[PDB]
Nucleic acid binder design. Structure first.
Lengths: 283, 124, 582, 205, 264, 283
DNA sequence: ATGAACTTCAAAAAAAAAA
């Protein structure tokens, strides 16, 4: 179980593609309406970490939460028929099953999952809780509409021989999504989030943009990862100014940004040397 | 329902695309695929790539018209729109992305009318 | 008029042979019965329950009215022949001995004094010898169905001698005269005047009888009983000088209407309804009716009953009144009859709230539409639930929307939020959610909870000039053009864009306006695409700029305009007629 | 006679039968009107008597379930503690009400020396025109006031124009003749509404 | 006892909280069932006055009688003693069971049902709890939760009215000190009577109309109309005090009345 | 027991997430319908303070009110079987049990709880009573609908394809929730709210947005905390103008606000120097 | 002699879906 507080400043961008796209709006990434800054949900990073763990582990005591056919009720029923089948008086039986799943699953240990379906077994508050990403420069939506020379269903097929199904494939030129996140210790002591799991989560956050790739997302990479390791479980200084110390603004006289040569990540670690640490894993 | 003194880049860009589409439609009634069926897909995002070919094809579309005074009126309203368009931007903001289509359909409605465009042209 | 209307229709029900009490009786729900012969000897403990899914306490027998015990020494009271299971067999389930033993001891004395005051009956002597045996009463405990009587608390045991079929012991010809005399002798020697219901002579009736069908137990209507509730030193009962020939009458009326077909719930409130003094009936109508027209209380109440039911069934129609229907809206507090609704007016003025709610719910409908002109309330809420009409919130949805609709109150914002979630979740706005939002907006405009906007009409509002309504019409015409382009559509632009179109317009419409010209070019009929382009121009003309985000009322306007335009386009010759007038 | 108009937002002419649930009377109680006239001006010489009530606003019921107390005060218990004596007494209040009570006054047995009818009449007229009162009039309950205004004939519109609904026996005025100075023991003589044609009249004892 | 009539126009609002919920349908504020305006009962303001007097005084000759169990924990002789050694008795009234007129004490201070100026908006703000109380029928094996409901109001300047008459003060003992304490309550009772349901409430304008005569040479309706409380010009919906326009009219009362601005 | 009156002006915002969401509204935060200002209930801040105390204490005489597995009737029965089991004559027995719970519990001492279940023990009026928060600039609802590649229960629509369960996860771009609150002294003298408990409550209010975090709420921080410390238990000036002195409006020519660089917290402590004090803990 | 506590009174309600 970990005992220190970690305030990591995850920074990641996108070369050309659709990172965290919005089902609410067709196929465009989440962008700020009033300004234009791109937004990326934390569930995308969580799924990238899960895929990295699935491809760089394959062992027990670190379940990865299977895809599609993985019914949550079936997994809950399978985890219930272990040490606390019935002889535990429902109440503490749920807590025992939750502890067993935390010791067995890695997704529920690092983040969390819903285990209150049919056979209830409590819920996990979760230690590490990432936030929604947000860029600084107002990004623009390119919208790269592409075509296909093969129809899907015969009903929507044309009355001729030219069977085409176009559509749109949105893309993004740039946008350093300044992600945020905080890690607690009280819930980590209950879920069993040890330091080895924390190091594995850091390695996943660092090297998830090298394997989890597709045609819609294109090419994505992680810039830097400045973790603010504390000293105790108390609160020294508000995290607002702590995360504001690593500001990311524009460089010289430029309108937009295209790569890392147009951003100036101002890192001035001067007032955060009281009872806090600093490490660089991605940058 | 059209604001010609909004001083918005998206408004004038949409109005310009609308009058371009109107000119292309007036050039030939039996038109299958107009510019809106291909040029509008990236007009509000990459205007500097589509509006160049648009202005290149505009004089030929005006010469294709059977009436020469109609082309004169269309160029006059084109320039009255582009008065507030000090420059063609690289990419439009979300608000400007919406104002593009706003001005487009506003200018299309203002053009497809009985006595309106000619009435505004007479006071010039 | 509150209690005068009760006595007035009790006098009509008692004269029209409707099965009601007759001076000192009460249709008390008695569960298990006691069968004896002519000198005691318990026979069978028959039960007359088996009615609803919740087994009530037997059938409502016309037994003498309860004298209203209630007290630390409640044993000294004791009713006539019907009472409690601890009053007859001296057996208590959760009360213990002594407390229940004195109840039976006083019940025996009451039975003995009734037998002494009325001899030669062959029915009261049997119950006198049965209560003074201390053997057959213990045999009642060892009956074939005694285990069921001890389960349900409050098992009223009534005696019924043999050789009388359904005639109870207290239902005999002599005991009926004794009950009629008790209400005319020991009940006719109290305070003098002056009555409040009838207002004539009669003795002031202290201790009003209980009314069953309201709170946790039968509780009296006019029941003042506290150190601060008394009027000018009247000390309970006398604060409302009401006579017995009115107190008993209205209490029995309430007991009879709270256990039959008149009992129906408005909005989480059990309201009894009964017809007022009907018209003397004209000659052309009373000539075919033999009698002729009897002023029956529970007769023309079916109109208002169906209306309050058609609100939940969708079969509402504008009713012509001229027939006054009483509506006493009693409600249970702790144990006091709380009156919530009372309107002497006819069904026309009683249905004003329903009429306003359904006119605000009046939405556009196409030809041969399965949805009726007026939608049922459960069917309307089914568009807001998860899947089946059962997951609704029982505090702000199925418990507050009915109250706000049946009283013309203000609709909560919970309706807005639920309809929004289910509109952008189900990816379609069927008949049910848009009409609810239109009703909410109209009621908020009428109640000052909405300023810059205005009330909506039935048909499509081609003007409005609002930033959300025209956007909804825009999304509707976009989806209509996309459907006309692709007939067999699976993942429409709606099912992929309406999630943010209702919230962020500049994100969805920034690409829908791009996809639109391709859909127009895809149309085989170029004139149809021309008309659709003209109408979308007329729609977007009212919008000066696409807003950043649509507020909570703006999303409702979006949904309303969407449904309005999608039904105006699916009309016979509406879009073509609009395009031809330009 | 004095045509004093009583107006107010909400009312609560609590019926004698529904005191636990303060269901207001259909119209203003004649006893309440006499109490209003006495709170405007009264003396051990003047005896107010209500003659006719003319309704000027439609009957509009509004249920307001208030939380009341159910135990009185005395020298015994030095405190009350409403947490142990709470009473959720309903109150079917009358929203938007207006009545012009036509009434006069007589003289009691203890009239004293200054028993002039004209003097008390002029005093009441001045108190009603200027806005003076011994106590603020109440619309059945002191939690609701009365925007009183002395009218010379008619200065407002009435909704009950044609034949309306009869309200049955209502509390006319409790009998305090058998009561000593400062009433204690009384009765309750009541009267019929006859018919609410436009302005219901009262039957004097 | 005092010697003047005081008919004030109390003005109090609600920033964020439940002013006076209605137990008719749970706890929603008693809005007008026809115009939408919130109707706060005057008994709530009287209870707030009692609570402020209990908090501030905490001594004899200023008790409450009608007090709380969670906040603080011949014939005319007893009536006079109760009037002397209690504040609520002289304030809103009393009811000695062994009194005169059926044991009654009317009292000078007569409040009014606080009607909001603009139609308020009952915000059904349900708030859940992560812990149940008793053994609920649904509190099974999972998370013991219970769905809550605490209605709130965005804004609503409730208009309260009072009618202090020295006639009843001559019998109840309501002196000038008790009147000053009542004013200090109406000014500072909304800064102490706070909770999680009531939220934040404040006193706006305590426009007291002191009449020179003991009978009060001014009508109630006229004094209420002289304090016009309406919405502002460019304000579409009221949200604070900068959205209202409490324009007082002290132009026709400069003969004998006194418009005491003790609150605003 | 404290003796001074404190009128703190709590100011806190939200970067990206759902702060105080409404269950009666699906999953959207409480916003003003007529205008658009975001609203946050005080129970969220109370639970954040409770979590901070639970993670930064673990001792007796400061009960934290357990979560999920904490029946209130069981806790009341456990607190009843102490010093006043029966020999106290019900009446004053309830007051004694209430005082014991106030000396033992911290949530009931600072705020309050319902102790009138089965075994009644009175109720606590509560000294510190926070209010509902409210922003100034009309915030907008982003509604970031996200998906899931794993179905939960045996859904009727979960056929043979992708077992997906989407939904919505609402987010908020900005909104400085101008919270309010007042602290009394009469109830604090009865509940035993000493100055140490007041300092602990201030520290919790300051450093609760650094540990209590989740995926739905995202990243939240506390701006400033201007406590108006009085001098006595009386009333000097109405609190309306006192809280109005610290106005928060827009900056220059901007439409909305994105961070602290767009707000101008006007703090002009000029007329509040009569018999009051001023301190800054969060800002 | 009389007001708050106590002890007894009965052991709820259900359709709210439909053309």
């Amino acid at each position: 179980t970990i005992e220190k507080r970690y305030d990591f400043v995850f920074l990641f961008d996108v070369q050309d593609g659709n990172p965290n796209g919005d089902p609410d709006a067709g196929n465009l990434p989440r962008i700020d309406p009033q300004t234009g800054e791109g937004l990326v949900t934390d569930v995308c990073l969580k799924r990238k970490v899960r895929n990295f763990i699935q491809m760089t582990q394959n062992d027990e005591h670190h379940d990865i939460f299977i895809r599609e056919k993985g019914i949550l009720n079936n997994l809950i029923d399978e985890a219930h028929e272990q040490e606390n089948v019935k002889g535990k008086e429902k109440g503490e039986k749920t807590e025992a099953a939750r502890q067993y799943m935390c010791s067995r699953y890695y997704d529920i240990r690092t983040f969390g999952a819903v285990m209150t379906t049919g056979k209830n077994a409590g819920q996990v508050r979760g230690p590490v809780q990432l936030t929604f990403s947000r860029s600084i420069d107002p990004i623009m939506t390119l919208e790269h509409s592409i075509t296909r020379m093969a129809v899907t269903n015969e009903k929507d097929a044309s009355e001729t021989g030219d069977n085409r199904t176009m559509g749109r494939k949105f893309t993004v030129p740039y946008g350093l999504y300044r992600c945020h996140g905080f890690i607690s210790t009280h819930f980590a002591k209950q879920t069993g989030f040890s330091e080895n799991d924390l190091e594995l989560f850091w390695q996943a956050l660092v090297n998830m943009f090298d394997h989890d790739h597709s045609a819609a997302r294109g090419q994505m990479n992680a810039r830097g990862l400045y973790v603010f390791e504390h000293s105790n479980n108390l609160g020294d200084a508000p995290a607002d100014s702590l995360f504001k110390r690593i500001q990311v603004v524009k460089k010289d006289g430029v309108e937009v940004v295209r790569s890392f040569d147009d951003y100036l990540v101002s890192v001035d670690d001067k007032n955060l040397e009281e009872t806090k640490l600093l490490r660089k894993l991605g940058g | 329902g059209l604001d010609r003194n909004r001083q918005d880049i998206g408004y004038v860009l949409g109005r310009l695309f609308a009058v371009l589409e109107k000119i292309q439609a007036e050039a030939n009634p039996g038109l299958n695929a107009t510019i809106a069926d291909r040029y509008f897909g990236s007009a509000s995002s990459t205007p500097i790539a589509v509006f160049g070919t648009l202005m290149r094809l505009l004089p030929h579309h005006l010469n294709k018209l059977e009436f020469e005074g109609r082309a004169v009126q269309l160029q006059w309203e084109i320039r009255q729109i582009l008065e507030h368009c000090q420059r063609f931007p690289n990419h439009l903001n979300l608000e400007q992305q919406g104002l593009f289509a706003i001005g487009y359909y506003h200018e299309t409605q203002f053009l497809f009318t009985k006595d309106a465009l000619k009435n505004l042209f007479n006071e010039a | 008029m509150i209690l005068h209307a009760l006595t007035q229709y009790y006098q009509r029900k008692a004269e029209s042979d409707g099965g009601i009490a007759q001076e000192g009786f009460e249709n008390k729900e008695i569960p298990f019965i006691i069968v004896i012969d002519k000198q005691g000897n318990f026979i069978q403990l028959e039960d007359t329950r088996e009615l609803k899914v919740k087994k009530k306490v037997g059938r409502t027998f016309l037994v003498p009215k309860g004298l209203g015990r209630s007290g630390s020494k409640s044993y000294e009271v004791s009713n006539l022949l019907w009472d409690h299971y601890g009053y007859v067999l001296a057996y208590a389930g959760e009360k213990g001995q002594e407390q229940a033993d004195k109840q039976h001891a006083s019940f025996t004395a009451k039975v003995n004094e009734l037998k002494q005051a009325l001899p030669d009956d062959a029915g009261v002597t049997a119950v006198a010898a049965f209560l003074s045996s201390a053997e057959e009463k213990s045999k009642v405990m060892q009956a074939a169905n005694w285990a069921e009587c001890a389960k349900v608390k409050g098992c009223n045991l009534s005696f019924r001698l043999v050789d009388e079929a359904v005639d109870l012991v207290c239902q005999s010809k002599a005991v009926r005269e004794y009950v009629s005399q008790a209400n005319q002798t020991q009940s006719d020697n109290a305070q003098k005047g002056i009555c409040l219901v009838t207002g004539k002579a009669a003795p002031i009736a202290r201790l009003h009888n209980a009314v069953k069908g309201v709170n946790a137990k039968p509780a009296p209507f006019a029941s003042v009983n506290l150190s601060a509730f008394e009027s000018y030193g009247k000390e309970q009962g006398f604060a409302f000088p009401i006579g017995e020939q009115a107190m008993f009458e209205y209490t029995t009326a309430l007991n009879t209407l709270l256990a039959g077909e008149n009992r129906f719930r408005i909005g989480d409130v059990t309201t009894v309804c009964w017809g007022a003094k009907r018209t003397p009936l004209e000659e052309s109508l009373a000539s075919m009716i033999n009698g002729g027209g009897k002023d029956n209380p529970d007769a023309h109440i079916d109109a208002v009953k169906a209306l309050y039911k058609s609100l939940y069934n969708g079969q509402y129609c504008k009713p012509d009144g001229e027939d006054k229907f009483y509506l006493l809206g009693l409600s249970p507090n702790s144990a006091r009859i709380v009156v919530r609704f009372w309107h002497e007016t006819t069904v026309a003025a009683l249905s004003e709230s329903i009429a306003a709610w359904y006119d605000d719910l009046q939405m556009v409908r196409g030809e041969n539409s399965p949805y009726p002109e007026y939608m049922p309330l459960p069917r309307l809420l089914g568009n807001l639930v998860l899947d089946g009409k059962m997951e609704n919130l029982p505090s702000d949805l199925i418990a507050q929307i009915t109250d706000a609709a049946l009283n013309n109150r203000v609709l909560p914002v919970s309706l807005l939020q639920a309809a929004l979630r289910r509109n952008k979740a189900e990816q379609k706005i069927t008949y049910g959610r848009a009409s609810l939002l239109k009703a909410y907006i109209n009621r908020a405009i009428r109640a000052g909870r909405l300023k810059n906007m205005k009330e909506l009409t039935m048909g499509l509002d081609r003007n409005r000039q609002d930033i959300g309504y025209v956007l909804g019409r825009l999304f509707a015409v976009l989806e209509k053009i996309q459907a006309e382009a692709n007939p067999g559509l699976n993942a429409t632009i709606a099912d992929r864009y309406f999630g943010s179109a209702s919230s962020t317009p500049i994100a969805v419409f920034g690409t829908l306006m791009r996809l639109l010209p391709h859909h127009l070019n895809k149309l085989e009929f170029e004139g149809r695409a021309v008309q659709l382009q003209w109408e979308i121009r007329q729609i977007l003309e009212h919008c000066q700029r696409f807003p950043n985000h649509l507020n909570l009322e703006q999303q409702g306007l979006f949904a309303i305009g969407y449904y309005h335009e999608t039904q105006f386009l699916f009309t016979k010759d509406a879009l073509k007629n609009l395009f031809n007038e330009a | 006679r004095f045509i004093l108009e009583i107006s107010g937002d909400l009312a609560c002419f609590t019926r004698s039968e529904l005191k636990v649930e303060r269901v207001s009377y259909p119209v203003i109680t004649p006893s309440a009107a006499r109490n209003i006239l006495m709170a405007i001006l009264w003396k051990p010489a003047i005896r107010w008597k209500v003659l006719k009530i003319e309704i000027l606003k439609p009957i509009q019921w509004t249920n307001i379930r208030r939380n009341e107390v159910g135990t009185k005060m005395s020298e015994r218990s030095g405190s009350l503690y409403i947490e142990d004596n709470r009473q959720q007494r309903a109150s079917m209040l009358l929203k938007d009400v207006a009545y012009r009570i036509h009434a006069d006054f007589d003289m009691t047995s203890e009239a004293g020396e200054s028993d002039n009818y004209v003097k008390f009449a002029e005093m009441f007229k001045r108190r009603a025109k200027k806005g003076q009162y011994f106590h603020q009039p109440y619309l059945g309950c002191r939690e609701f006031p009365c925007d009183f205004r002395l009218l010379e004939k008619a200065e407002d519109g009435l909704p009950l124009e044609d034949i309306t609904q009869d309200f049955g026996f209502m509390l006319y005025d409790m009998d305090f003749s058998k009561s000593d100075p400062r009433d204690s023991n009384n009765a309750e003589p009541m009267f019929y509404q006859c018919k609410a044609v436009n302005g219901v009249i009262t039957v004097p004892p």
